[PDB]
Design a protein around this ligand. Structure first.
Ligand SMILES: COc1cccc(C(=O)N(Cc2cccc(-c3cn4c(n3)CCC4)c2)CC2CC2)c1
Length: 302
């Protein structure tokens, strides 16, 4: 069984490389962030431009939705995160604390906390309501590429150019596990599986790996794409077949069968590295976004 994703919409508006795209949990919206310092909101189903959210002083590298689809958090080279009320467009809080560029961010499932990762090689945990830092984890010895909460929010997984994946106790801040394979390439992305059993990790040796967190073992490897230079998002696609989805530095979107690890589709159309992809929560829809030579977001439907 193979999907037949087909291009439906191309979304133009950002004036520099796109950084990160995410679908709202309620499925209505796509948020994008960009090196152009802007957040843009788009209709998830029609690709129709909705509004621009502005305020960061420098480029934004990541953006993420609150559980109720009402808030965004963004991570920027201005060394802040910003919490946004999407309807009003207002910046509710500016999170100051990192000493270098903030590269990655996420809400916990309860959306009372935010986790962030930075070039200052730390991971910080923030209180959403007060906008204050609760914990600072001396997490890595190189820039942090990704941070993600597990299903009940009790765990944080982080990745770094230092070659490590680490799992942290949210409440205590203690390192619970360090994961690394036979080699030490930079780890450029990590996230928990939807059921929370697994960890999907990208390394800059053109490889994605599915880990059993609790066993601390690599279960699956996904190859065939190009990933040696940039931190490319990866996803679990679950609305139809169970796929792994990733951008690639050959300007394609790759889709693998999660179980068999075979490539089942490649999406062609971007003119630069596909840095970010996202999967719609209820429809077979993928959003993809590319770097400076391209500047567009594309919406594919299977
Ligand atoms: C983290 O340390 C590094 C070092 C060198 C390159 C990059 C990088 O991926 N990009 C591309 C890029 C741009 C914007 C956003 C992202 C990005 C953010 N996140 C991810 N990629 C995965 C999780 C969070 C990457 C840098 C761009 C070309 C100048 C990252």
């Amino acid at each position: 069984v193979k999907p037949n994703y087909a291009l439906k919409f191309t979304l133009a508006g950002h004036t520099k490389a796109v950084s990160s795209v995410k679908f709202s949990p309620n499925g209505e919206w796509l948020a994008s962030s960009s090196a152009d310092k802007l957040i843009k909101i788009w209709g998830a189903y029609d690709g129709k431009f909705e509004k621009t959210i502005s305020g960061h002083k420098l480029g934004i590298s990541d953006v993420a939705w609150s559980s109720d689809s009402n808030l965004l958090v963004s991570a920027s080279d201005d060394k802040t995160l910003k919490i946004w009320d999407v309807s009003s467009g207002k910046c509710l809080k500016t999170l100051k604390g990192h000493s270098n560029y903030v590269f990655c961010c996420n809400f916990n499932p309860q959306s009372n906390l935010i986790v962030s990762g930075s070039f200052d090689e730390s991971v910080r945990i923030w209180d959403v309501k007060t906008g204050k830092c609760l914990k600072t984890l001396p997490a890595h010895s190189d820039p942090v590429s990704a941070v993600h909460f597990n299903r009940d929010g009790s765990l944080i997984v982080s990745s770094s150019y230092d070659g490590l994946c680490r799992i942290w106790d949210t409440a205590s801040g203690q390192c619970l596990k360090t994961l690394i394979d036979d080699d030490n390439p930079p780890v450029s992305f990590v996230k928990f599986s939807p059921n929370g059993k697994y960890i999907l990790a990208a390394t800059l040796d053109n490889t994605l790996k599915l880990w059993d967190y609790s066993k601390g073992k690599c279960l699956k490897t996904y190859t065939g794409h190009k990933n040696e230079k940039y931190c490319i998002f990866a996803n679990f696609s679950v609305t139809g077949g169970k796929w792994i989805v990733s951008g690639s530095e050959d300007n394609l979107v790759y889709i693998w069968n999660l179980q068999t690890k075979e490539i089942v589709q490649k999406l062609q159309g971007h003119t630069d590295v596909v840095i970010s992809t996202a999967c719609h929560p209820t429809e077979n829809i993928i959003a993809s976004a590319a770097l400076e030579n391209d500047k567009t977001i594309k919406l594919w439907k299977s």
